[model samples]
Target: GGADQKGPVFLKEPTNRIDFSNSTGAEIECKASGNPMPEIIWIRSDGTAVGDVPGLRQISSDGKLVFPPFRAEDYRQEVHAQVYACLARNQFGSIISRDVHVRAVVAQYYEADVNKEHVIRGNSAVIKCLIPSFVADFVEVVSWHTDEEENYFPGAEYDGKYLVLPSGELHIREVGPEDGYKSYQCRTKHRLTGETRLSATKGRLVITEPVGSVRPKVNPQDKHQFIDVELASSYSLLCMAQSYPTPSFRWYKFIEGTTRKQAVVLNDRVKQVSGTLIIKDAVVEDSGKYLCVVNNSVGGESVETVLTVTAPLSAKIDPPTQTVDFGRPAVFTCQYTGNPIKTVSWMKDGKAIGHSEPVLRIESVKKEDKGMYQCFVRNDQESAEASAELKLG
Candidate 1:
């Protein structure tokens, strides 16, 4: 009958994929049947032991993956959007389940792109409302508006003067002087957040006469851009434009929360080449809206991009080992440098101390309190830990 204590069979297996939004986290479960009690564990696709981040993401005693609650700003794309598999073991043998994927709806900043369109007096023209490709999947074009016609061609319907395409473009059947006199703007909605945004730059019809030089229109790959660079790294932004008289390029960085834009100051670290802005050894102060303006005698166009510099995370604990008298006191200090630190925790002997502070102190030295202490820190992009030990006199 001892032989009956046999194999680990799968009772339930995780689905192929699990998807979640920033507000709504996800959970995956697996089950196994074995004669002698079996233990289940979840491992990454790379066969590494899964990390347990209690309260956020962790594995339960029964091999259930938990993402109890979630926040968009605190989400980690690399950790939450990973593939994992379930493993069951009882020393008799081991069984594994098929790989499962966890996909999450990431939170992102939505920006609308509006470019000026040039059309001949009698030719047709199409004005586009562009959004960044990185977040295009989560946004939609609501409609178009104009300064001249407060309602914009009567609410995207057939107005005989203009048409709104499914792609959120305003199509003018025959461009006229009246169409050139007004500025158009596109409104967009971010589906997940239910937030709406207007295009940064107004969409205007620049009437190009067949007899003169055309005005300069910046033809950027994207009207809105988001770039993440690490501190002390190098990066560049480019502005490309088209015009008959050859456009001149100028750069500026829009002051945060203000309509005023400051001219780009060039130093050895920040340089300009034609329409390109290159910076070396970028610092935290360099993060913001970078504006590029291309101009000619005819006219000019401008675009802005948001650049965010992230600080890398590292940790160090002072007094790697400490000795205190039986009735004395002790302290340990943790130092970490980084940006957007999601968590900082203290642990003793692999168990949490129920406190979160850079400095940990024992009011009175106790026999039971002497052990290995660790300072752990992490962010959306990286994590690290440091350990210290205490000894009695």
Candidate 2:
């Protein structure tokens, strides 16, 4: 932690260099000559404390530091650095490292994202920027510029506080260049090396349909064509998309034998919002066609999509015969797979037949567990069917 508080220091390596040729516990140490010993510490770029031994070592309160074997044979992953010093006091200080030729590595700008973009008509739209793996001790100066255009679009530089780690997302409420261009590039400069890099770049936020508005889009504008839709677990089939122009959307379901069928009434599970279907606990019966019809009153068009419920997946035994032979124990597992995988049931005809270690375990194959064995798999909004047949050899 103290390393981030000071300037850079320069130092040389130990005379012997603690050769790690074949020995188990080799040691390499570097000292920075200064008025006071710099704040000495060992750490990984990821904010992890370096081990004290040749493989992993530490610093003692008495000021004595010990390291384990420091050679190739003793370590797996390459050790980035041998040792570094932070020499500083109120007035002046520096960061010194073993001339062991410590190579300066570029800080990785990991994950990045921006919130939805929106701004007043002509005003430039502000989009957030992010970078997670930046080491604290190093000097950082951030700059912003829009792509497509060369010159920096006159704006204040950014700092680290705005970027959220783990989920690197930036929140730039004040946006510039709200219209025209499609992308923006932001750079992070390491003050120490003067190395500047395009830390992140994101496109301007264009809400064809303003927030809180749902608008449907038709790819072909023809009932015969199917449109693609993406939905997370929280969202479901039968979505309602909105348009900023106050456009209206009509819902439709594709009939197996017909072009499409309209729901008699849109209910809680069948409503439209934000051009997405938010179905909860979907079911097999819910499988079918979904269409969002957008109308501007003067002219109207529709886009059709399909929503097929999926069940959990599980691995069964080798071979594909539905019939399990007698004398041998048959493991009729449902092996349903999903976020919350569905359960497997060993059924005879239509009723649940038996229970086993997993789902369907029969001590011995029996006639009762025979005849079109089916596993009825069910999840929140739907259910699926699987079958295994058993015949006594």
Candidate 3:
């Protein structure tokens, strides 16, 4: 085709902002048209032409300015924060697209295993400090500390007692009474910024001697206790005890109306670490008796805890809108679901109507009942309410 006679005009402007994650690449594009096809090029805020350079930057034929995959050092430069624009030119003239801003942001830190641990003396315990796998690349150092400031690195330090794993696991090979009352914290250093931050929470290492002439003793004295939790809530039970040589811990759940206790399986919802049992998203089926048995070479002991899952209350009113004759009675129905129906009541315009149950009755309906009618339901665990508008003819 011959070079048609017309100036270049922008068809689609480039995005106003291009955000780049430290571990990924980004591309910004601009589109233009003209009687003679316009050739596109990218220019930085400094008025310098941009071109395709391997492992650095690339400009596609269609006017896309691309940044190569980011490395740890990529975020250290100010080039990522510069402005860019698209330049379209033909024989007629040239035009520059609106300036687009470029930026790079550091990802947030994630916290895990944020609790105190009671490790039996002379046994290995893994203190966890986890970061999501996706954000791990941006992390420069995942170190453990005795306190908020005392850094503990891997190697022969402390006679190889403290080991920091690549996956954020702080392994204590042999805990002792000397390790008691020591608070441990996690520190993560960002690769791009070289800034270090302490974990939002800290954990403690309480080293207790193994069972001696006596036997292991479980806390809470009671052989059985109850733990009430709402549905879809997280709950944890700790079976703290005193023992020597780091007593072994086993968790089991007893079958209803039977003497058999089965090993509780570990999954996303259920986790057992040492003597602590964590249950995420509790449901009705999760209600049962859980036993934590602690055993050492000398003797053993067990304690039981019962969990009762209470379903949350949710209520709804049928036909959120209603109409009735001026002389007829109006009936509004309400239905609810929950573990236990503690009470059901009715209200009009935030005022109690002295009516109880799932139905609200208004004899010889009047305009007074034409506003909003509310149904309230509650259980031992939670409460819910729904509203309906009533209009009289």
Clashes of each: 0, 60, 7
Candidate 2 ranges beyond 4 A from true positions: 1-232, 237-245, 314-393
TM-score for each predicted model, relative to the true structure = 0.44, 0.31, 0.44
Residue-pair clashes, model 2: 60
Q: Return the candidate ranking by lDDT, descending.
A: 1, 3, 2
Give the C-alpha miss distance for residue 271 in model 2, angstroms.
3.8
Residues 5-59 of candidate 2: C-alpha lDDT, one tens digit per residue: 2222224323212322223333445444333445454444343445544444555
Candidate 1, residues 1-393, lDDT tens digits: the string is: 234454455577777667666676778998987767667888886767788876667888766898766776667755687888776666444555555777777666667878888765655567778889977867777778787656453233365666554435666755678878888888888766788887887878887656677776654565667777788876666554556555677888888999789898889888764455667677888888988887878898877789888886667679877779988888899998866577888866545684778898888888787656777776665555665667676
lDDT of 3 by residue, 335-368 (tens): 8886666788876644567567788877888766
Query: What is candidate 1's TM-score against the reference?
Result: 0.44
lDDT of 1: 0.71
Residue 35 lDDT (model 2): 34
Spell out the clash pairs found in candidate 1: none
Pick the winner on TM-score between candidates 2 and 3: 3
